[PDB]
Amino acid sequence: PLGSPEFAAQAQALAAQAAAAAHAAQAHRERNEFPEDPEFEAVVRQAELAIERCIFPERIYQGSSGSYFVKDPQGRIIAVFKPKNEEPYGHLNPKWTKWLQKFGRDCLVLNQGYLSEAGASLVDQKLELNIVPRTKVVYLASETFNYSAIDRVKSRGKRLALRFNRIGLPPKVGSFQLFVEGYKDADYWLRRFEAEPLPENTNRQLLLQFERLVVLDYIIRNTDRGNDNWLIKYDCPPVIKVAAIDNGLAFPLKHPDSWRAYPFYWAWLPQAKVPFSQEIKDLILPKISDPNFVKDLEEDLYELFKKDPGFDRGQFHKQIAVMRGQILNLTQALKDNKSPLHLVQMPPVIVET
Amino acid sequence: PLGSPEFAAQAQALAAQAAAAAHAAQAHRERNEFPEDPEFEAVVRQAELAIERCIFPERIYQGSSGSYFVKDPQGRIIAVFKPKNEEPYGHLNPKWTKWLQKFGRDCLVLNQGYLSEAGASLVDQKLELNIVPRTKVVYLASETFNYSAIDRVKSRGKRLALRFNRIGLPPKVGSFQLFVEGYKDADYWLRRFEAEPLPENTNRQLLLQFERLVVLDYIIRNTDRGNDNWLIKYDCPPVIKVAAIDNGLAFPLKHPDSWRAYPFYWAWLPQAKVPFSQEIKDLILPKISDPNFVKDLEEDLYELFKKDPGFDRGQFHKQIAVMRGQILNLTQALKDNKSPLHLVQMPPVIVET
Amino acid sequence: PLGSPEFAAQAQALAAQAAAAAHAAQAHRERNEFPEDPEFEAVVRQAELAIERCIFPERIYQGSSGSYFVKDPQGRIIAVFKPKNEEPYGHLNPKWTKWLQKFGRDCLVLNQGYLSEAGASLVDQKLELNIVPRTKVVYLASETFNYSAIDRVKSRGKRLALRFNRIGLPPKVGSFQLFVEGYKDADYWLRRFEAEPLPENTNRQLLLQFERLVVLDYIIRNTDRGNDNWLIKYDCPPVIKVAAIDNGLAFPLKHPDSWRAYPFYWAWLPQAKVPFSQEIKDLILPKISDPNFVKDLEEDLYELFKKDPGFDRGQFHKQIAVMRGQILNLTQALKDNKSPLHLVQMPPVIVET
Amino acid sequence: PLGSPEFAAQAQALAAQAAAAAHAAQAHRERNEFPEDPEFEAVVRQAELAIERCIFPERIYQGSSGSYFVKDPQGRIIAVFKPKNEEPYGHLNPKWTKWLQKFGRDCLVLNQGYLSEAGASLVDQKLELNIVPRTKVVYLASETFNYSAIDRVKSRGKRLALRFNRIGLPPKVGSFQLFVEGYKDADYWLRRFEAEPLPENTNRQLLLQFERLVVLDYIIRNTDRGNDNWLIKYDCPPVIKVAAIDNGLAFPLKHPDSWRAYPFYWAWLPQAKVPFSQEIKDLILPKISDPNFVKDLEEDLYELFKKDPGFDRGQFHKQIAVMRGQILNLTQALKDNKSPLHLVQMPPVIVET
Amino acid sequence: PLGSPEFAAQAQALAAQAAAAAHAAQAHRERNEFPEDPEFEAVVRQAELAIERCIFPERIYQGSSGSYFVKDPQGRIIAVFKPKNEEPYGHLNPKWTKWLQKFGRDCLVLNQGYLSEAGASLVDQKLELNIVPRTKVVYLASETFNYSAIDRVKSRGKRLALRFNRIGLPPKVGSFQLFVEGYKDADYWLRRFEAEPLPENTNRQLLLQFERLVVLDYIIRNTDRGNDNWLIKYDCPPVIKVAAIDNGLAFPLKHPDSWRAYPFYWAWLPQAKVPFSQEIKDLILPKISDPNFVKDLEEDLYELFKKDPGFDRGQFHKQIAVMRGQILNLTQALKDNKSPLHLVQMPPVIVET
Ligand SMILES: Nc1ncnc2c1ncn2[C@@H]1O[C@H](COP(=O)(O)OP(=O)(O)O)[C@@H](O)[C@H]1O
Ligand SMILES: Nc1ncnc2c1ncn2[C@@H]1O[C@H](COP(=O)(O)OP(=O)(O)O)[C@@H](O)[C@H]1O
Ligand SMILES: Nc1ncnc2c1ncn2[C@@H]1O[C@H](COP(=O)(O)OP(=O)(O)O)[C@@H](O)[C@H]1O
Ligand SMILES: Nc1ncnc2c1ncn2[C@@H]1O[C@H](COP(=O)(O)OP(=O)(O)O)[C@@H](O)[C@H]1O
Ligand SMILES: Nc1ncnc2c1ncn2[C@@H]1O[C@H](COP(=O)(O)OP(=O)(O)O)[C@@H](O)[C@H]1O
């Protein structure tokens, strides 16, 4: 029916349903569905629930201004939430990027912290490191988040959606990282271990965890890893665990102008001279040296990243080019039984496809 | 020394000191000095003090999103603070006004609520009504006010001024109205009085207070007087007092397009039919019928108003033209022993100078 | 003669001579006169001389693309020259700065490397540290510098100035740092000393030098000090000397967004835990705690900085505000016999005047 | 399958492969393949090879700033390379052409020297003159070419392409003309011949070569032929050869405003009065008087020319119109046994199609 | 006191009074004062008076849409009022003139009808012709004029000026021409006279009047004189009078492109062949041939014309240049006892000063 009334009717079926799909996309996102990870989705519902019952995510007192401790309805801290528009460069929305070079010393993209945060977790899972607490992109509305004067006043009047939902403040997008319990700043424990050495079996464990951290931080090329920035959990009377937690500043789009800037702080630790174990070599090498694994990972990051309103294909390629370079270096250092310290000394490479 | 080296040196004395004055004006304002009213200034210091000791002005739960209960260091509520940039139209700063007509149904100016608030108090004092709690333009900085993401992050780092002041968040300008104790919504009491009439002596008092309210609300042509909006204080075992408290929406720049919109809600009360007393006639008439009193008042409002960044001489004339018209009507109704109700029925006049 | 023919003639004396001064300013700068330091000026003449005789400054092979080893007519390396327009952000000349915020993660100004370079030397002298080899702002023309295609072709034809000078390529402005002989990367020596400890008297010397480095790097808040970046000279059969040499990335305009980025690399050395000596306390404290010394230094930097075409008063204040903050911290740590390591741990302060 | 799923899939086959073709076009060009002339391609590989082994094309000392002597890995000069962006008007890239007339005295196009250079060779081959050394459009990257500050710094970091190529500096496009050995400035020999006349047989040879030069220079209407600009090779104890070498300024788009400007310098030589031989008449006439030969040549030049980013169809027609006019004049002078001198005296014609 | 406090105070006397003068100029104009002609001013007051008492100027039924019959309070027609903004090209206010040539066939200025109207009267008086009824530039406000929707609604609300004037609609500027009684279309009478000739004495009178018309229409170069356009008053049982009444389209800025367009319609009448009398020659020649009279007249028109908001000095010169040309021709034809018909046949001249 190439030019017939039967087809022109079908084209109008598609037209109006595609406009129905495009109208109701924002509501579909703000629903927070994770078919692929029900355990996480549960914790989000729990977060949403305490919000209704009026137990509000509270600002983190000593950290940044942009991060919140999400509480469950009982009162327990269950997650950390960092909203996109509460990041430092949260303004500058009318993308002003193409106007700038058509620059600069900056090596990170402008306002995609929450996506770095989420992407770190995504690389973690793909590599099976389990050091980054599951963290995903999530919508949340709360009295305690930083809204604008207009946003607040608009929201005093009763509003209803249509499925007769009440509408509070506009939900903010951000990273929602699962909170983990009984951990401490890596350096706190690290210096105690210096005073008291650990039983060699336990210490062998700490070292396996630490290697995983190195791998993760090298691939995403974290910009901001201190030794206060990862966490160690350790209880004596016997397991020891690390948690990689502050990954808002990774996935740069070029290696920094000077090598000295943005160092990996763990590279100065004595642990860093210990050559990579076999355990890490056959957990990681089978993956990162398969071109399909890297191809598949790149695409996972593409999907996650595109979500952002400000997404730029040009940037994403630059970002991936850096990562490829890291993967390359890492592969080498893994094949030659080198150590984390050796790895950070290898000259940075970019790989263009 | 009209073109000599002795004078050219004196001109450079003036140049650099006038630039020193213009540099350090913002710090001079944010200091909150009131030579003319030390009692008020004291309460501001007290507000500033609790801020340092970490007793923060808290958001008013049931009212608007833009208003805060300032507390003293003890915990007592001492003032209401409404910041300019937390008003509904707080955005729209790059004055976009001349671009609009060179409009509209709107009869109030855009973002000068705090000045209406302050101006109401200023008219109160000039007329000696003492129904508006002293309220002035004040700078305050606090964790609990609504700042932007940038403003917050910028302020985590230690900053010092130079007289080695610490610098918190940037101080906000707004209205700072003295809080008054033991009052209730005018209509709460008003309906009780209907059930229980008041002793005629007390009732005569309520009526004197009420006349003052009428006068104030008519001259500034309040846009937003409900009967929940003014307050009555009354304790039995014998004085009764009114408080005019929510004057953010007065000093319009034209009479509203339709007379029916923005009514004075007290005009429907039975009290409003009672003709103006002698007490009010010789408290007000000697003032508002002296052209110099009005001239002097206009200039007080000019000085207060100009403070605003968005101030517009064109608007201020329109504003004053309306007020003159009200004063005119009021003068008439006062000379002819008319009642508040009669007064609100008189056709609105504008007076152009 | 306020409006007379005698004065109008004098005003024309000034008009045409001020236009003569403004015409011939560029030639006056490109002359490289240093009344205040004849020893340096000599070395510049020597550099200019080898240029004529065709001994060309050669590109530094392993470093950056923007730096040249200036040779005397004999062949000896006598200076390092880094031209402004060969810096990384050398383009972007039509100042596009005000168009950007009226940003950003960048904490250094755009294209003022040569001035940081020169300013470091200027702070050195003022404090009498003598660890930075004298370095000033200098004009040089050479075949080997990176010119544009036009600049090169234009310069094949014979040109003459008028004092019948020949004109080669257009002279470039940059930093001209005196070359120092027999030094090596600080870490080269530092690790040898670890194998072989130094005689305690010599080692006490190394420590006095090192303190000076700390002081310099903290005040200008160098962004880019590695342990390959300063140099140690040491000959055994007994003095030891440091040279602070790569100061192109100091005088930031804000403390970096994250404390972890741009660390001072010497802070990890064991030397850094040794508390500040008396020798440094009475060489520096008498200076940096006199408000006039700081006032005088600020003005020296102002004069040097303004030279740049892109200079911005707004930036320069931000820059000075940072430095004041450093001076403040430094003063404290010097009074309390603290160590360099303690000093870098003190929270960064900004001081606004 | 005009609107079916089988076809929509095929359209996506084309879409993504055409985008793959368009992505990887620049890499395809920078490869320098000449199926049609393997002997030339070889010399390019040889040039590329010495570049890797670090034998760099060196600047031509006495000529222009834009030309380089390409060396093979042995050290021998094998080619002359003139990059497009090192031509005099190499800037002005954002084509600013249509903005200019919607002018001027200029009769050559702005920045297509390398194409004139290449086109001269292309006309040579088509006419079988063999006086222009084979010269084609070629990409080359080298330390010694004139790059920008950014281009240089960007290229210090290791980069890799993906077929795991290393990436040096960005390759420049230009003309790559085969270097020819043992030649001298035409006038050098020409004046010696005046002192010593040549054996009449040899001299008859010189004259056949010279006619070919005339033909070539007249058709492309070279703008810049001196008598230092073509070369004669001559060895006594017996052949003599000319080489037409500097053809960067031909293919004008109009005849010059004044006939006197841009003369053909050989027209003043005594040789120029000698009428065209039969040898040239039946080598050239059979060609240039066949309309198909001219049609075919025009299309060869079209293909070569379009390569340029700045190409303009409007200009190319004007260019071809001039050439047609020359061909016309030339045909005439060839039919009537006229001499080169007669030919240059014939009034310039333009032929529009 | 050239730079003293005594003078700076006097300069502020001038500043604020000159701003007082400039503020209250519009009110000063809208007052309609004619010191120089009290008889006219009276009739304006009378017009204003009937307006208040609600006897409104009524639209002229058969003429243009822009003209009104002003009535006195009794009901008698006393004047014709043509408002500027009711002319055909009344829009186009934001002068768009300089944007047009930096054109055209149009030979009149855009929207200055009322000034032509007024200027005709002004030329009449200066020459003492007394055929144009006194007409001046006048402000009037009336319900019946054509106002905009906004103008009307704005004016329902009571407004007062400050000398406690009420404010009706905004007053319009226009021409206010005295109405004259018992006249008829010139051609009505003219054709009757053809049937009945007039007594020769009366006819001699008609001819003197007619000459005056010719003079007036030629000098201002009326564009639009029909024979219905001037009026004759004639009563039998003995004077006869003409009235020149519709002069809205004179003072062109160039002679029309074609001579045939805009003819003087009286030129076809038989009267027009009768040579100019002595009476007109010594009433006009003594004037128009004195250069000072013309100089003085030009300045009177300048003053009148400048009033217009759209006034343009460039145009006014062109206008005066045309008139000078007419005066020149007229002078000639008056000296040589020529007739009106001869005069209109003389080629148009422009005279530039
Ligand atoms: N997923 C997590 N589980 C447990 N503790 C966390 C987690 N994320 C952050 N923290 C802790 O909470 C605080 C939050 O700060 P962080 O998220 O690192 O950003 P910043 O310090 O820049 O605000 C830190 O003390 C950190 O140790
Ligand atoms: N100066 C004051 N003294 C005492 N009570 C006040 C004062 N101002 C406001 N209130 C009370 O506090 C609440 C604040 O609301 P208000 O200032 O009227 O603005 P909104 O209701 O629009 O937020 C009201 O309940 C009012 O009764
Ligand atoms: N003033 C100086 N005296 C002696 N050696 C120097 C001096 N400046 C730099 N060098 C040395 O020369 C090289 C130049 O590099 P440098 O100026 O540090 O910048 P980059 O390494 O970024 O090019 C380094 O090896 C350094 O050790
Ligand atoms: N293809 C070639 N073969 C041999 N010699 C050449 C060739 N091209 C140029 N030369 C010689 O090398 C020098 C290069 O200059 P040229 O290419 O003519 O441009 P310019 O003189 O404008 O730089 C000249 O001396 C010329 O004689
Ligand atoms: N000053 C005047 N005195 C007497 N009658 C007039 C006067 N002006 C106009 N009229 C008459 O009133 C009518 C008005 O028309 P007029 O002013 O000529 O312009 P239009 O015909 O274009 O509207 C005409 O009939 C004219 O005869």
PDB file of C-alpha atoms and ligand atoms in Angstrom, chain A residues 60 62-64 67 69 80 82 133 177-181 185 228-229 231 245-246, ligand 1:
ATOM      1  CA  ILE A  60      27.586  15.533  54.112  1.00  0.00           C
ATOM      2  CA  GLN A  62      32.845  17.623  56.014  1.00  0.00           C
ATOM      3  CA  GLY A  63      32.938  16.577  52.338  1.00  0.00           C
ATOM      4  CA  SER A  64      31.666  18.581  49.354  1.00  0.00           C
ATOM      5  CA  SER A  67      26.725  15.098  48.278  1.00  0.00           C
ATOM      6  CA  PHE A  69      23.621  10.613  52.742  1.00  0.00           C
ATOM      7  CA  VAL A  80      25.410   8.405  48.821  1.00  0.00           C
ATOM      8  CA  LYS A  82      25.490  13.331  44.301  1.00  0.00           C
ATOM      9  CA  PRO A 133      30.031  -0.280  45.699  1.00  0.00           C
ATOM     10  CA  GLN A 177      26.197   4.771  45.322  1.00  0.00           C
ATOM     11  CA  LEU A 178      25.484   2.048  47.832  1.00  0.00           C
ATOM     12  CA  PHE A 179      26.780   2.964  51.297  1.00  0.00           C
ATOM     13  CA  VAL A 180      29.183   0.447  52.871  1.00  0.00           C
ATOM     14  CA  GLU A 181      29.570  -0.165  56.585  1.00  0.00           C
ATOM     15  CA  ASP A 185      40.252   5.896  55.361  1.00  0.00           C
ATOM     16  CA  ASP A 228      41.979   8.981  52.181  1.00  0.00           C
ATOM     17  CA  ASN A 229      39.862   8.341  49.096  1.00  0.00           C
ATOM     18  CA  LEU A 231      38.584   2.723  52.222  1.00  0.00           C
ATOM     19  CA  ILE A 245      34.460   5.261  46.616  1.00  0.00           C
ATOM     20  CA  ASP A 246      35.136   8.654  45.075  1.00  0.00           C
TER      21      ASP A 246
HETATM   22  N1  LIG F   1      29.780   4.377  49.220  1.00  0.00           N
HETATM   23  C1  LIG F   1      30.267   4.765  50.424  1.00  0.00           C
HETATM   24  N2  LIG F   1      30.229   3.933  51.488  1.00  0.00           N
HETATM   25  C2  LIG F   1      30.710   4.301  52.694  1.00  0.00           C
HETATM   26  N3  LIG F   1      31.257   5.509  52.952  1.00  0.00           N
HETATM   27  C3  LIG F   1      31.357   6.442  51.977  1.00  0.00           C
HETATM   28  C4  LIG F   1      30.858   6.112  50.627  1.00  0.00           C
HETATM   29  N4  LIG F   1      31.073   7.194  49.861  1.00  0.00           N
HETATM   30  C5  LIG F   1      31.651   8.132  50.654  1.00  0.00           C
HETATM   31  N5  LIG F   1      31.835   7.687  51.914  1.00  0.00           N
HETATM   32  C6  LIG F   1      32.423   8.452  53.047  1.00  0.00           C
HETATM   33  O1  LIG F   1      31.578   9.588  53.257  1.00  0.00           O
HETATM   34  C7  LIG F   1      32.255  10.833  53.061  1.00  0.00           C
HETATM   35  C8  LIG F   1      31.770  11.469  51.741  1.00  0.00           C
HETATM   36  O2  LIG F   1      32.737  12.136  50.918  1.00  0.00           O
HETATM   37  P1  LIG F   1      33.033  11.705  49.375  1.00  0.00           P
HETATM   38  O3  LIG F   1      31.866  10.963  48.762  1.00  0.00           O
HETATM   39  O4  LIG F   1      34.401  11.068  49.320  1.00  0.00           O
HETATM   40  O5  LIG F   1      33.192  13.091  48.579  1.00  0.00           O
HETATM   41  P2  LIG F   1      33.743  14.439  49.267  1.00  0.00           P
HETATM   42  O6  LIG F   1      34.688  14.043  50.388  1.00  0.00           O
HETATM   43  O7  LIG F   1      34.408  15.155  48.108  1.00  0.00           O
HETATM   44  O8  LIG F   1      32.438  15.033  49.736  1.00  0.00           O
HETATM   45  C9  LIG F   1      33.718  10.451  53.188  1.00  0.00           C
HETATM   46  O9  LIG F   1      34.043  10.492  54.576  1.00  0.00           O
HETATM   47  C10 LIG F   1      33.820   9.001  52.788  1.00  0.00           C
HETATM   48  O10 LIG F   1      34.795   8.367  53.618  1.00  0.00           O
END
